[PDB]
């Protein structure tokens, strides 16, 4: 911690400054601002840049073994920056998840700009504890100075309140919203993949019918086709216009499959193949639109904007788990819930490591643009 922590901050600073500067350059030149996701990623890069600008202060502070020579105003500003980085990151990740859900399940720049304004104001307003509380504190008569978090008797429950604000308002609600959005995305992708797989089975068996000689192979292919069509009729796209032309189209399709099976069972092969040939008119008339929609939805997964956001959101909330656990334990200790000396020493000796690893996303967010680009 005496030398391990300041080295990681130095690594995060140089790589993050070099990295997050190229992301701004790339987004402003190559991945031009034509979508909401680009705007949100640019704002995320700017927030990371601000935090990395204030990072070397804390790097030096931890290197000198918790002595703060940068002043009082800098002590509160370099803490407001950290709080702002956390809140801006969580808010922008929620906005990105909502944008992905809207773009996938429900296929405006003004809305994005207003949302960015609201996010950069809400993060600053939620970082007010670090502005109205953080100050330099002299440890007793020793010449030691620390960037403490003062609170008077009127401002009671401030440690517990700050911990709860970090846990539920800063982390838990964003995590629940992101999980809901990605669960809805997964449901839509599963429906689309079910439809696409069933129709691929149907088309493969239709091609088998085309290259068939006896009625047995035709009959087996028609059986598989009917099963696939019945399965596909149940894969109704998520959101009468709908639920009445999709199902009617598949009813027509299964009726044609039944006619082909009826012809095949009698021993006729040419008429069965003719009915199988006619089976694609129903596709071109009723089901082609939904097949195109399903392929479009499945095509929004392989783009290199979904994997970047998926990696950024997953890594961020994975790297903040260790710090949220110890922060919650700290609140319990000061609430009097747990008074164990062994556990108390664990929290204090591991909190710097958790807070150091909780801001590695500001370093390796640009790395995702190259690893998944």
């Amino acid at each position, epitope marked *: 911690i005496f030398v391990m922590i300041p080295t990681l901050y130095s690594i995060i600073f140089v790589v993050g400054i070099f990295g997050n500067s190229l992301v701004v350059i790339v987004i402003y030149f190559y991945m031009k601002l034509k979508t909401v996701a680009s705007v949100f990623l640019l704002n995320l890069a700017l927030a990371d840049l601000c935090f990395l600008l204030t990072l070397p202060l804390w790097a030096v502070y931890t290197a000198m073994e918790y002595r703060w020579p940068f002043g009082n105003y800098l002590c509160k500003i370099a803490s407001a920056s950290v709080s702002f980085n956390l809140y801006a990151s969580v808010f922008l990740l929620t906005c990105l998840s909502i944008d992905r859900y809207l773009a996938i399940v429900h296929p405006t720049m003004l809305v994005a700009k207003v949302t960015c304004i609201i996010i950069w104001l809400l993060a600053g307003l939620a970082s007010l504890p670090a502005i109205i509380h953080r100050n330099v504190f002299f440890i007793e008569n020793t010449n030691i100075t620390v960037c403490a978090f003062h609170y008077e008797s009127q401002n009671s429950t401030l440690p517990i309140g700050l911990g709860l604000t970090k846990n539920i308002l800063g982390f838990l609600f964003p995590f629940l919203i992101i999980l809901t959005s990605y669960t809805l995305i997964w449901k839509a992708l599963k429906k689309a993949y079910d439809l696409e797989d069933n129709w691929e089975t149907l088309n493969d068996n239709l091609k088998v019918i085309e290259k068939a000689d006896n009625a047995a192979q035709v009959k087996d292919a028609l*059986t598989k086709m009917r099963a696939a069509a019945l399965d596909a009729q149940k894969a109704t796209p998520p959101k009468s216009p709908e639920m009445k032309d999709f199902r009617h189209g598949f009813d027509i399709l299964v009726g044609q499959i039944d006619d082909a099976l009826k012809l095949a069972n009698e021993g006729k092969v040419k008429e069965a193949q003719a009915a199988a040939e006619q089976l694609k008119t129903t596709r071109n008339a009723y089901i082609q639109k939904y097949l195109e929609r399903a392929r479009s939805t499945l095509d929004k997964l392989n783009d290199d904007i979904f994997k970047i956001i998926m990696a950024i959101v997953l890594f961020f909330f994975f790297s903040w788990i260790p710090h949220q656990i110890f922060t919650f334990l700290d609140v319990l200790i000061q609430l009097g819930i747990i008074r164990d000396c062994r556990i108390a020493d664990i929290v204090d000796t591991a909190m710097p490591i958790t807070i150091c690893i909780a801001y590695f996303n500001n370093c390796l967010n640009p790395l995702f643009y190259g690893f998944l680009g």
Partner: antibody
Amino acid sequence: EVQLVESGGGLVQPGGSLRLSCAASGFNVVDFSLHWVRQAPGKGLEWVAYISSSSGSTSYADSVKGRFTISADTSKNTAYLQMNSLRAEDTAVYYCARWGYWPGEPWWKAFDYWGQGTLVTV
Amino acid sequence: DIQMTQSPSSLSASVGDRVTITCRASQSVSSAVAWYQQKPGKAPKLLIYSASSLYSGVPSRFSGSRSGTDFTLTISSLQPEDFATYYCQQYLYYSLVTFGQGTKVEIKR
């Protein structure tokens, strides 16, 4: 008041001919496909043959194909089953279920109403 | 020629017990699997017309399910009148009908 009844079951020498009726009520044969399901004594249910009055299409199980013949009469609401060259494996209780027509819920309700069943022995 | 196989040949259970009968299809037959209940000496009775859609007039304790090609029938409260042979039928097409081998649910002593 929907009901399907069977007749024609009895003792017949092997290799003989037997006629099984499925006089129905409460519907018409033109609305449903009348299937014939047998069940050997102390065994499971086995599908035998079916007829679709609307389409005129008849199918038979691979173990009864050719030997058995199934017909229907719209006026009488009867689905006859002509069995010829009966063997020892044809001793069973022959039921006569009904099955709806695609598309819709009547098709998904498979064999919703069964006949009382008739016993034939060789 | 889809083949349906019922795993429990016999199911001895007591009144009030929860019984589950599993029936598996060789191919995919969609949700076109029905469940019956044949008392000894009479015709079967439909219970679940789709894979999991309950029929009308039967008690709501019966409940089916589908997990691909595996179909299960469940009776929550094994009432004294729920002791009979239960068959699974695959009805993907008129000429493709195949029944299960039956699951004689008995009284546990």
